Amino acid sequence: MDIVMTQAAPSVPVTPGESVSISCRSTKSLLHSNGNTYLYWFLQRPGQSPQRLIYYMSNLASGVPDRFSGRGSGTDFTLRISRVEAEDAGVYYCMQSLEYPYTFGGGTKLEIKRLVP
Amino acid sequence: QIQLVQSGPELKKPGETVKISCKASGYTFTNYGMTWVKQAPRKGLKWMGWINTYTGRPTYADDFKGRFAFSLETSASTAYLQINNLKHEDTATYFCASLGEDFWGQGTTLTVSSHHHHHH
Numbered sequence A: 001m002d003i004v005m006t007q008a009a010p011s012v013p014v015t016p017g018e019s020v021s022i023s024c025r026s027t028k029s030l031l032h033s034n035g036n037t038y039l040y041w042f043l044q045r046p047g048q049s050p051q052r053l054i055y056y057m058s059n060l061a062s063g064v065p066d067r068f069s070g071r072g073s074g075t076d077f078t079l080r081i082s083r084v085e086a087e088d089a090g091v092y093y094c095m096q097s098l099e100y101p102y103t104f105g106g107g108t109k110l111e112i113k114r115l116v117p
Numbered sequence B: 001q002i003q004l005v006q007s008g009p010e011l012k013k014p015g016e017t018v019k020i021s022c023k024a025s026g027y028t029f030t031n032y033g034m035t036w037v038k039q040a041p042r043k044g045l046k047w048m049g050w051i052n053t054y055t056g057r058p059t060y061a062d063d064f065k066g067r068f069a070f071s072l073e074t075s076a077s078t079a080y081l082q083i084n085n086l087k088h089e090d091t092a093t094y095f096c097a098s099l100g101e102d103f104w105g106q107g108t109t110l111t112v113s114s115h116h117h118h119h120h
């Protein structure tokens, strides 16, 4: 039976330099007997391929800065971005790779809020 | 160092067939699998399946069983995705990835159009 991945919201608001959290839930625990938790976070900006931010639930991919972090247990996962910059705008997706078929969450658009002059 | 390069955009009429390539470079092709990902308008990212580039064995998500075929030309370090009998709902950008290594192609945008398929 497919593991369904769900993100709590389709977009979340933030202002420059402030922090934000994006959530993801699985229907089954992603912790394997080997001790790894088979959860990825990706970002996809428009016009680009997706790029991995986090692997094994909490490990930063190379080149990813220290302001990103991940936490969770079992079936509840949170990605945090601590000091948001323009370049962070995009859609964030969780994905499980514990069992076939691999499944993505629906994505959460990070929306940087600005006043209308 | 490492580059996955996909074939260019496709614009198609319903019922046609398309075949997209993904050529891998800068690592040993058969050491790592290739995954196919479908990026919609209004349906985020979908994992289509993956193919073992050493054995040739494919694993498909249930939703992609029927009209979709994964194949290889391993001597060319190339993986292919063929989509038969195109539907409007196949409109998307298709990515190849070596997901464990986080290598990504640039994407191939496929547009299935009843009345604009002739613009290229």
Ligand code: NA
Pocket (backbone or CB within 6 Å): A001, A002, A003, A099, A100, A101
């Ligand atoms: Na399964």
